């Protein structure tokens, strides 16, 4: 296979500014027959099918705004957006369309750049209703933060956890360009009641030091 490597993986962009996404192929996509580069760019908007942007490295598909342009040769290619619009958010993929198999790049997420916002960190003990049924879900909420990158570790009686929590992140908020994150720790009722202190440790750019939100079980 030809490997298609995109840089960067994540691209924060202030609407109105230019953006560029690089795509490197492991082998040349330039045909000796016609001197065309068989490189294609797609955009996949949130919850939608992918859309064709550019083919033959530099030819815009009909209906694609002129702010989108492609350049490059052989193994190195660049998608440029001259002036980014809010509706340009999503994941951009390059594709080898020179030789089978028709491999995609890993994708570059274009997101709205805004001022750094530290998460508001909230912790929820399991409901009495859930505990009665025999399970304890402990939810740590990181609300309205930017950027997306965050580290959440669970500590139970100062013992670091692993393999018993799951994370979910919302798509970038349409109004304020922030993210929210849930970390849910799942224990059986018996395992839950063996321990006192339940702590969510949060690392984020907006926080000067790692932050711990905690409760004592039964309080």
């Amino acid at each position: 296979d030809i490997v298609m490597t995109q840089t960067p993986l994540s691209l924060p962009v202030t609407p109105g500014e230019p953006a560029s996404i690089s795509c490197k192929s492991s082998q040349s996509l330039l045909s000796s027959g016609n001197q065309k580069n068989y490189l294609t760019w797609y955009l996949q908007k949130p919850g939608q099918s992918p859309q064709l942007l550019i083919y033959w490295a530099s030819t815009r598909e009909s209906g694609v705004p002129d702010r989108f342009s492609g350049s490059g040769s052989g193994t190195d290619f660049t998608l440029k957006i001259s002036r980014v619009e809010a509706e340009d958010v999503g994941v951009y993929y390059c594709q080898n369309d020179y030789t089978y198999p028709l491999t995609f790049g890993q994708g570059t997420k274009l997101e709205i750049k805004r001022t750094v916002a530290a998460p508001s960190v909230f912790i929820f003990p399991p409901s009495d209703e859930q505990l009665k049924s025999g399970t304890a879900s402990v939810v740590c909420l990181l609300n309205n933060f930017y950027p997306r990158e965050a580290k959440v570790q669970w500590k139970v009686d100062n013992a670091l956890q692993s393999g018993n929590s799951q994370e979910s992140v919302t798509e970038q908020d349409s109004k304020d360009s922030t993210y929210s994150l849930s970390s849910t720790l799942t224990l059986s009722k018996a395992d839950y009641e063996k321990h006192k202190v339940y702590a969510c440790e949060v690392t984020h750019q907006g926080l000067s030091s790692p932050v711990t939100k905690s409760f004592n079980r039964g309080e």
């Binding site: 296979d1 294609t40 994941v91 594709q95 028709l102 994708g107 309205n144 992140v169 908020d173």
Partner: protein
Amino acid sequence: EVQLVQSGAEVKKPGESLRISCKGSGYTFITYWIEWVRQMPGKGLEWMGDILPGSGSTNYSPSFQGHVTISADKSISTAYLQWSSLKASDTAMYYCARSGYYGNSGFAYWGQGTLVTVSSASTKGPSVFPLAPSSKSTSGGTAALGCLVKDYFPEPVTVSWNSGALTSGVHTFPAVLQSSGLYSLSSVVTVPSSSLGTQTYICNVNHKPSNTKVDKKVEP
């Protein structure tokens, strides 16, 4: 207008067979390649293979060859992707696309996608638990509350607040597949802390596959 219409969402058990379809209209079906693309939940696009319906000529990614068969019936303008024996790892969105040979001018037209869920789980309605507001969920006059929507299959659930009256400050998280093979999500909202003991906050949860509908009052 050119259109590719894919078959509907599929929920299957591991080891079962499956065929999904892509029907092309508004052009001569035999003359363009039909491409198949996999997208696993939250992951990138993966090229699987293609077919020219007129000749039945195929190309496969060596990564998918043996596990899938791509075929076409030119008499009914339909292309197919099929499995003999599904694996849990086949759980993905599958797109078809219209293209030239080698995809040389890109995949210009795409189907709406077919969601395929492969799981040992059976259809199950969720339990809904309050994420109660407290001193542990309040900062700067605003308090966070929510609902945990746990142990459902398959996707999806929808969540509203106060029958659609409350929309501001609502974040409903994408579903996660739990260790159990059942789905879970939370829906959260930030509200004034002064309204916590006076205003009523109810999450309305709908799970259409099981006909489960749950309303949960969230109080401190």
